[model samples]
Target: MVKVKFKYKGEEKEVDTSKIKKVWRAGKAVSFTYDDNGKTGRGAVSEKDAPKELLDMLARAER
Candidate 1:
């Protein structure tokens, strides 16, 4: 599981990759839907802003 902290729309947000229930890619951007401790929400980030480990995991998932 990768926990990545990033800025979205000038606000800071954190994501635990392990809790991601779905993922979508649009161009160089990636979006995620997560269910964490019964709280569900969605977020997005560009490839450039995403954590290295998260990118690695996404790359591997593509295969």
Candidate 2:
């Protein structure tokens, strides 16, 4: 979970990561999240739209 801007429901919100539940990855790309509450929350990240330096830093696993 991460504290960032998210589009939940039909509204734009900045979510608190503490209440964040699950996250689905988008390859070595971007992704979204499932909140503790009932809402579709997707924080941003990816190659083209992502910060390569940070995205790479966060995606570094099993490497």
Candidate 3:
């Protein structure tokens, strides 16, 4: 897991891909929901901002 600058919210926050629930696109960026600790979090990341690992997970995600 790693952090990236949010498209809307701004700043950087960590995202655990394995815990990600939903994924959606926001223009050239992508937004999603995921688990953080015992809580859930919603975040956004751009293609250029995300690494290949996260993109791979995003592509393989059916939900």
Per-model TM-score, in order, reads 0.68, 0.38, 0.65
Clash pairs (backbone) in predicted model 3: none
Worst window of 10 by summed lDDT in candidate 3:
2-11
What's every prediction's RMSD, in angstroms?
Answer: 2.2, 4.9, 2.8
lDDT of 1 by residue, 1-63 (tens): 788665667898887878776666768887777776889977778888888777776777677
Task: Report the lDDT of model 1 for residue 19.
Answer: 74
- Which pairs, if any, clash in model 1? none
Q: Which regions of candidate 3 deviate over 4 angstroms? A: 1-8
lDDT per residue as tens, model 3, 1-63: 644445445655565457777777668987788777799888877777887767776787745
Report clashes for each candidate as comma-separated counts: 0, 0, 0
lDDT of 2 by residue, 1-63 (tens): 445454555576665545544444567655646474776655644445544333444455324
Quote model 1's TM-score: 0.68
Name the candidate that leads on lDDT.
1
Instruction: Give the CA lDDT, 0 to 100, for residue 61 in model 3.
Output: 72
Candidate 1 regions off by >4 Å? 60-63
Q: Candidate order by TM-score, highest to lowest?
A: 1, 3, 2
Q: Higher-TM-score candidate among 2 and 3?
A: 3
